[PDB]
Amino acid sequence: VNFFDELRIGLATAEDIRQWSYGEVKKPETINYRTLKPEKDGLFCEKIFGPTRDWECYCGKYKRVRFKGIICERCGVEVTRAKVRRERMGHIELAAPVTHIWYFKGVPSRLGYLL
């Protein structure tokens, strides 16, 4: 509940990020400029993070209040308060490995000393 004996910062890894996130962003499109709704798998799609509103399935199939933890097959979204939208993340998949800017540029450069 509120017990924190310690706090340790660990260096993550690809599989860790795979575990953390709930989606795979693929398009840069922001909220729609006409209907003011997210685009399919866009940067705000409810299929990634969650419903814009609370207890509201995207297609309206399970919009009733008495729905919690039930994922809608018709629209592929989960039914929970809008707060859950603030507590879920997404991960981009890379087609080419990269480096962490904080290391090859930091002074001292951890990569330089280690390698």
State in angstroms the smallest separation of the CB of 57 from other proteins: 22
Residue 48, amino acid: I
Nearest to 76 by CA among 112, 33, 41, 31: 41
State in angstroms the smallest separation of the CB of 85 from Zn ion: 16
Nearer to other proteins, 74 or 104 (CB): 104
Region of 5-13, 37-45, 46-54, 65-73 interacting with other proteins (CB under 8 A): 5-13
The answer to the question of residue 59 lying near Zn ion (CB under 5 A) is yes
Which of 65, 94, 114, 115 is close enough to bind other proteins by CB under 8 A?
94
For other proteins (CB under 8 A), the number of binding residues is 34
Which of 27, 37, 74, 100 is close enough to bind Zn ion by CB under 5 A?
74
Taking the C-alpha atoms of residue 48 and residue 32, their distance in angstroms, rounded to an integer, is: 16
Query: How would you label 59-93 residue by residue, b for 16+ Cβ within 10 Å and e otherwise?
Result: eeebeeeebeeeebeeeebbbbeeeebeeeeebee
| Contact (CB, 8 A) for 65 and 55 | yes
45 is in an annotated binding site: no
State in angstroms the smallest separation of the CB of 52 from other proteins: 13
